[PDB]
Design a binder for this molecule. Structure first.
Ligand SMILES: [Ca+2]
Ligand SMILES: [Mg+2]
Lengths: 63, 156, 156
């Protein structure tokens, strides 16, 4: 009864553990991925606001 | 307690990943305290996690690393089910005594009893354990218990 | 130099380095081989609103020494160095596109960028999506990666 209930919950906890541990590698890979995205977009944003890039960009069409 | 100080760095690595996932700021949402611990190899029940500070939903409390220390320590002492208990549990649902439980009965115990799981969680564990029903719609619960206990990479 | 040249072990592809050389030639108004505050002002006025003298002086300051082509290429490669390849960025995005649709739901990508990892601030968000290729509520990351890496969609 209360014992059965506890045992069942412990089994569900094993399941909860399994699922989250399974998801771990994907979360690690994705942190790498989101890091790359965030970093390169920012680099792009900084570049776009760099006067030299603004000058270079406006000049290109004449090449 | 006597954490290997390796289990401390382990916790540091897990903490950093979760911190990153809800905004890298040196704090992890308390709703994720249980999942952090689960990543370290333990299987706390909901009730165990709440008792050490885990919250019921995202956006209530955020915790720093040092808060995770006593919590993780406390959870290690949490009772973990044994194969004997699991077989004794499922046996009660085996009227025939042949080691079978219907896929439906299994989904029922998992989503309606104890600290209930979602139908989506059940879907995922059934899929990950590659659990198959026989022609009659039944499953061998011993196999399922073993698969669940062994882990996602299969010796855990 | 005036046609083909490298100051360094800058790792810029020969094709871009050649572009830069030709831009350099146009930028160097008086065609003497160096880019002075005068050349920068003239070519700018020619092409639209020129930055103010303060800005003109501040960009010339970035070149510690005669601003010849070597120096020009030097400040551009230092600026462009240490970024990921189109392929790496694309795969990064694909990690959140399991079904390989080649797109991401616009709210999902906005949520990833603003609320996870190293949160983008409101201005970064605004600047990022003003340029973003979005249609049907789908952010085209393959086009977007093409754009930011220059092999794409920013202009023209
Ligand atoms: Ca955080
Ligand atoms: Mg000149």
């Amino acid at each position: 009864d209360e014992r059965l209930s506890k045992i069942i919950s412990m089994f569900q906890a094993h399941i909860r553990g399994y699922l989250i541990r399974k998801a771990y590698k994907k979360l690690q890979d994705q942190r790498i991925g989101l890091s790359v995205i965030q970093r390169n977009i920012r680099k792009w944003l900084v570049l776009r606001n760099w006067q030299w890039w603004k000058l270079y960009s406006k000049v290109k069409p004449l090449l | 307690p006597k954490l290997s100080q390796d289990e401390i760095d382990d916790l540091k690595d897990v903490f950093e990943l979760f911190d990153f996932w809800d905004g890298r700021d040196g704090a992890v949402d308390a709703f994720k305290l249980g999942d952090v611990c689960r990543c370290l190899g333990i299987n706390p029940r909901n009730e165990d996690v709440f008792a050490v500070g885990g919250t019921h939903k995202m956006g209530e409390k955020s915790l720093p690393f040092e808060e995770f220390l006593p919590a993780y320590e406390g959870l290690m002492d949490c009772e973990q089910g044994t194969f004997a208990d699991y077989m004794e549990a499922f046996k009660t649902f085996d009227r025939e005594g042949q080691g079978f439980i219907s896929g439906a009965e299994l989904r029922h115990v998992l989503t309606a009893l104890g600290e209930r799981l979602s139908d989506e969680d059940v879907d995922e564990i059934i899929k990950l354990t590659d659990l198959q029903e026989d022609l009659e719609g039944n499953v061998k619960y011993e196999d399922f218990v073993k698969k669940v206990m062994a882990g996602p990479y299969p010796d855990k | 130099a005036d046609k083909a040249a490298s100051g360094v072990l800058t790792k810029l592809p020969q094709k871009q380095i050649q572009e830069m050389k030709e831009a350099f030639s146009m930028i160097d108004v008086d065609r003497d081989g160096f880019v002075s505050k005068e050349d920068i002002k003239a070519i700018s006025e020619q092409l639209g609103r020129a930055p103010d003298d303060k800005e003109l002086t501040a960009m010339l300051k970035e070149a510690p020494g005669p601003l010849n082509f070597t120096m020009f290429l030097s400040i551009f490669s230092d600026k462009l160095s240490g970024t990921d390849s189109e392929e790496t960025i694309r795969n990064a995005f694909a990690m959140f596109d399991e079904q390989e649709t080649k797109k991401l739901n616009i709210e999902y990508i906005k949520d990833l960028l603003e609320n996870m990892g190293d949160n983008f601030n409101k201005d970064e968000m605004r600047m990022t999506f003003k340029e973003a290729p979005v249609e049907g509520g789908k952010f085209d990351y393959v086009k977007f990666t093409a754009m930011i890496k220059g092999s794409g969609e920013e202009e023209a």
